[PDB]
Design a protein around this ligand. Structure first.
Ligand code: SF4
Length: 1118
DNA sequence: TCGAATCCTGGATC
DNA sequence: TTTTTATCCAGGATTCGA
């Protein structure tokens, strides 16, 4: 006991000293106060017996920047269930044995959705156990749970208990759920004295957020030449930081040759960047002064970029060299999770947001690229290798650089991150840094728990996962999965609204549309616009012009016309389908309940049936073979966990070991025993959805959708008011309006993110509310919608690109496009409607709409209303100027999500899948693709378009023929060199074989083992001519030898090229030019020639030849 | 002797 | 206590059978 008590109370007292040093005082005496809740953490406090008690600390900040704490007790608890009539016996035992280890037990009725026939109104009983402290709960939990499983397998005083629930919610989550306490609101707090718990209440009459002091910093480090730094060998060079927009810098005079002068730096006029600099003689004075000043300002938030990895451990180690205890002086320490934390201030790292919520591509997550995109300017570089000489020769250029990593970090954190995470906190019972670090599945689950609690619903336990489950015929299932969505590119080449194209349109489709024009328009006016057709005056005329143009299309169906390009898509399709079908994780059933439900009367209508496709993957062996495979294991013996241990029999293994060994044994047996190792089989299934079941989930999604659209509207209102304030030019009014705009947009983005999270959660294996069926039906209905949206277009025109949620298509110029209706309504005098939308939304409304939606009218009545609903609608983007798609070089393949698209201004509108997003495999390919995409815009006929695109191919092919004979001498290297890197150590690869490995060995044979020892080896390398016919993984040369010393260069080349007979060793002679030509000739062949061949023009590039099958088909034409 | 299929690592995917 | 991983692509080597 004593060690535990003194350990926890001592660390508590130290934390109290630490946060008292930063000015957080515990609320000392009875009183009443208000503030903004900035953080909370669990801690123990003593009771009136001086026993331990679990509690939570709340940290508050006031308007004036004063700060205080409160501590708050709450007894945790969990539920258990029992057999018929057992609760008096069970409670008698449980109270007697654990006396003084549990606080309270009671019987409570609960709503439980798995109980048969429960819609009649029944609800079941549970016993609640509650404990003085969490450790006593953990001990009783571990004594209890062994008794449960055997009882479930059977389907006496302890053994009768049957089940347990909610035993694993985190205690701070439990309290924050239960008392409705959420960060980022103002609160009134009252302390009466120890006779009463402290009382907290939210107040809604306050809005504007307070202004926390936040700090951002960066560090710069000495290193040995061609070495990474290490904390023993290398001193600090610079540490630079911002607080309250003021900058500060310190730099080590051990390497800096003279004292630095202060200066002002400014990326843009809005970025004030004043700095102050101290010069002191050594690194110990640097670190001491840094702590001495940081202890002055006492910030609340600290931010760094990937700072858990590089920035903190470095200074922690350098602090250790001088014996400075940062964990006492600052109070930062590394948690069991592996990440830095402190009891009193929050460490926010921008990268976890950039990785999760920015939608930047992998290439762009460099700090300087992220700054360039988000802030609109580039911080200019200095290489770390240069710092030592710059600090010798001209240090103030390095000082000028050292601002660029700080200021961009601070402004990125403030503008994008800071308004957002605090907004997302307001709706979820989690801490800001937990909400940043945790994944969106957990974020959703912590939300749904709140609704399940307030509806008094007992949670389900986590979905424990089975292994080696058997198909009914006996086959061992290796996976299950629903058939996903299907993406296909139907067509290839160039479309431009400036040049004609050939259309052949079915003559019945324009009659089928013309028969229903009034239907197509009435629905779009009444339902979408919400103006009754009574109130529109010109409605008869627009119908006449529609009918007459459609008839004119009927008269001449096959024609040449300039194209219209349109993008059609469905706004948040998956939420809308969930709402429309009433899909809920629990709402699925099978007849085993409907056989026993008192609502299953003749003429009941609560059953909705739907279909989905299941894709079994399973091994070929039969059940009777599997039983023999099992029984053969019942005499096998297995190794211990470590060489000293005894051998284990197969029943002494863990279940993952058992499954792994059975899978290995059966796969090995099957490879001989059967012709094919495993099988896949698509099979489609019906599933009932019970329509009457409790609505809480779908109501939650509905609420989030509507709140999102409210906040969108208020955002636009405030943005307009901000524009007015900007034109008025009152700085206080501009500030107020901008702060409103920032808050409202931040809430809009939070709501969007949470709403999108609701679909993906049910994918999370193990998750509390998990089902496969709903994730099947929600896909297969989307594939139905997007198939029928294709059929009707293929008759009118031609689709070009399907998608997960939209279509790109081309339509004839003579199509009706857009119209305006004239209306008497005060709110809406003129209204614009687009025909392509109203053409489809009727079809969707007719086919998909649901006629079985029911709702409970009055809880005591058992009366339900029957209703119909539909939220599924199409919308339209465009038209556009040009659209371009590549083609597969292999005949049978259709690509996915490659194309480009251009606005009518010629500013690029989209570009997807192409390497020009990435670093590219080679700079030559990246630049080529970039130049050709722009070049396609030029010219005015297909022959002219390809004729003037090919002049970009020739300008490069002249290079690879002329061996860079014009290009500056070393500038060849930065064009031709790959800069790839090895992923892992060769000691971590082991048996693997690759180019990067081969060149790593080639580097090792020059450098020795000095570098291959290091992880993540960087490579710069080329392909060498002289080893003619050597297999490609043997070909590489590392660049650096061409820049090393002359005799070394000569000797190692003579070693590598297998010849002494080449006189002049230059990359121009040495490269396998034809390899790079054979690569450019394979990029060009998917963009400029094969697409052109698919549109019946001749090959525009004589220097490149078609693939065999295409040439065969083309000659077969002749 | 040649064609195609499997499996591999590697980056990338929102 | 817990994290996106399956899917897709791209280049590459090795095996199998007419
Ligand atoms: S779907 Fe209707 S009839 Fe079937 S179990 Fe549910 S409530 Fe009863």
């Amino acid at each position: 006991s004593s060690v535990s008590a003194l350990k926890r109370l001592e660390r508590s007292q130290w934390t109290d000293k630490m946060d008292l040093r930063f000015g957080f005082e515990r609320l000392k005496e009875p009183g009443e106060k208000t503030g903004w809740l900035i953080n909370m953490h669990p801690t123990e406090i003593l009771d009136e017996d001086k026993r331990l008690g679990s509690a939570v600390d709340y940290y508050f900040i006031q308007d004036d920047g004063s700060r205080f704490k409160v501590a708050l007790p709450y007894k945790p608890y969990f539920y258990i269930a029992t057999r018929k009539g057992c609760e008096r016996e069970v409670s008698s035992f449980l109270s007697k044995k654990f006396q003084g280890k549990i606080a309270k037990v009671e019987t409570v009725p609960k709503e439980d959705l798995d109980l048969p026939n429960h819609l009649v109104g029944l609800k079941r009983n549970y016993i609640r156990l509650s404990f003085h402290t969490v450790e006593d709960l953990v001990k009783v939990r571990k004594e209890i749970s062994p008794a449960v499983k055997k009882n479930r397998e059977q389907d006496d005083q302890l053994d009768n208990i049957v089940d347990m629930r909610e035993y694993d919610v985190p205690y701070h989550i439990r309290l924050s759920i239960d008392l409705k306490i959420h960060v980022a609101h103002w609160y009134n707090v009252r302390y009466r004295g120890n006779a009463f718990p402290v009382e907290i209440t939210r107040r809604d009459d306050l809005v504007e957020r307070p202004d926390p002091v936040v700090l951002a910093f960066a560090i710069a480090t000495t290193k040995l030449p061609l070495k990474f730094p290490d904390a023993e060998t290398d001193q600090i060079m610079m540490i630079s930081y911002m607080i309250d927009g003021q900058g500060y810098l310190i730099t080590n005079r051990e390497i800096v040759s003279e004292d630095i002068e202060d200066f002002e730096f400014t990326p843009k006029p809005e970025y004030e960047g004043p700095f102050c600099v101290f010069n002191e003689p050594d690194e110990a004075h640097l670190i001491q002064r840094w702590f001495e000043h940081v202890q002055e300002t006492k910030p609340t938030i600290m931010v760094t970029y990937n700072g858990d990895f590089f920035d903190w451990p470095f200074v922690e180690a350098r602090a250790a060299v001088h014996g400075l205890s940062m964990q006492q002086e600052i109070g930062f320490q590394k948690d069991s999770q592996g990440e830095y934390k402190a009891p009193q201030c929050i460490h926010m790292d921008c990268l976890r947001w950039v990785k999760r919520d920015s939608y930047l591509p992998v290439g762009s997550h460099n700090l300087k690229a992220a700054a360039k995109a988000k802030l609109g300017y580039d911080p200019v570089e200095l290489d770390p290798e240069d710092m030592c000489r710059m600090a010798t020769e001209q240090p103030q250029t390095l000082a000028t650089y050292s601002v660029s990593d700080a200021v961009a970090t601070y402004y990125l954190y403030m503008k994008y991150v800071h308004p957002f995470i605090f907004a997302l906190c307001t709706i979820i019972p989690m801490e800001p840094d937990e909400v940043l670090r945790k994944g969106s599945g957990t974020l959703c689950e912590a939300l749904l728990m709140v609704q399940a609690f307030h509806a008094n619903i007992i949670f389900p336990n986590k979905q424990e996962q089975e292994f080696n489950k058997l198909t009914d015929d006996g086959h061992v299932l290796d996976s299950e999965t629903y058939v996903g969505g299907h993406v296909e590119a139907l067509e290839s080449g160039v479309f431009r609204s400036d040049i004609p194209c050939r259309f052949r349109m079915n003559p019945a489709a324009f009659d089928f549309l013309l028969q229903r024009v009034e239907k197509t328009l009435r629905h779009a006016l009444e339902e979408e616009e919400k103006v009754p057709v009574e109130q529109v005056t010109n409605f008869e005329e627009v119908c006449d012009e529609i009918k007459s143009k459609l008839a004119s299309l009927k008269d001449v169906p096959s024609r040449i016309e300039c194209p219209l390009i349109y993008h059609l898509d469905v706004g948040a399709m998956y939420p809308n389908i969930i709402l429309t079908n009433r899909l809920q994780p629990s709402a699925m059933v099978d007849e085993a309940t409907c056989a026993a439900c008192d609502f299953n009367k003749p003429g009941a209508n609560c059953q909705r049936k739907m279909a989905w496709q299941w894709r079994g993957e399973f091994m070929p062996a039969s059940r009777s073979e599997y039983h023999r495979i099992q029984h053969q294991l019942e005499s096998e013996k297995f190794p211990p966990l470590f060489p000293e241990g005894p051998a284990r029999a197969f029943h002494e293994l863990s279940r993952e070991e058992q499954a792994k060994y059975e899978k290995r044994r059966l796969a090995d047996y099957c490879r001989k025993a059967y012709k094919k190792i495993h099988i896949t089989k698509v099979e489609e299934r019906l599933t009932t959805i019970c329509q009457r079941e409790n609505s809480f989930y779908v109501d939650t999604v509905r609420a989030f959708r509507d709140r999102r659209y409210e906040f969108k509207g208020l955002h636009k209102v405030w943005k307009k008011k901000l524009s007015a304030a900007v034109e008025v030019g009152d700085a206080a009014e501009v500030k107020r309006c901008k702060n409103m705009e920032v808050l409202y947009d931040s809430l809009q983005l939070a709501h969007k993110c949470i709403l999108n999270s609701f679909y993906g959660y049910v994918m999370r294996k193990g998750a509390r509310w998990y089902s496969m069926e709903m994730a099947g039906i929600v896909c297969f209905t989307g594939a139905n919608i997007i198939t029928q949206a294709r059929e009707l277009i293929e008759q009118i025109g031609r689709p070009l690109e399907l998608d997960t949620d939209g279509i790109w298509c081309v339509l004839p110029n003579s199509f009706p496009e857009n119209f305006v209706f004239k209306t008497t309504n005060v709110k809406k005098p003129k209204v614009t409607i687009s025909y392509p939308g109203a053409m489809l939304n009727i079809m969707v409304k007719e086919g998909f709409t649901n006629d079985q939606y029911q709702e409970l009218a009055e809880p005591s009545s058992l009366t339900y209303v029957t209703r119909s609903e539909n939220s599924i609608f199409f919308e339209v983007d465009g038209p556009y100027l040009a659209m371009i798609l590549p083609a597969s070089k292999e005949e049978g393949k259709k690509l996915k999500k490659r194309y480009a698209v251009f606005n009518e201004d010629g500013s690029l509108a989209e570009l997807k899948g192409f390497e020009v997003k990435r670093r590219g495999e080679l700079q030559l390919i990246k630049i080529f693709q970039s130049s050709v995409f722009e070049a396609f815009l030029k010219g005015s006929t297909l022959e002219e378009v390809y004729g003037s695109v090919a002049k970009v191919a020739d300008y490069w092919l002249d290079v690879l023929y002329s061996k860079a004979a014009n290009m500056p001498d070393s500038e060849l290297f930065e064009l031709i060199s790959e800069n790839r890197s090895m992923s892992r150590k060769l000691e971590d690869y082991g048996e693997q074989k690759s180019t990067s490995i081969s060149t790593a060995k080639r580097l090792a044979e020059f450098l020795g083992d000095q570098m291959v020892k290091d992880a993540g080896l960087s490579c710069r390398y080329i392909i060498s001519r002289k080893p003619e016919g050597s297999p490609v993984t043997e070909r590489a040369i590392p660049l650096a030898i061409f820049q090393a010393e002359p005799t070394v260069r000569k000797h190692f080349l003579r070693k590598w090229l297998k010849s002494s007979s080449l006189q002049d060793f230059d990359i121009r002679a040495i490269l396998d030019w034809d390899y790079y030509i054979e690569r450019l000739g394979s990029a060009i062949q998917k963009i400029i020639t094969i697409p052109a061949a698919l549109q019946q023009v001749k090959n525009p590039v004589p220097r490149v030849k078609h693939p065999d099958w295409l040439h065969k088909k083309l000659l077969e034409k002749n």
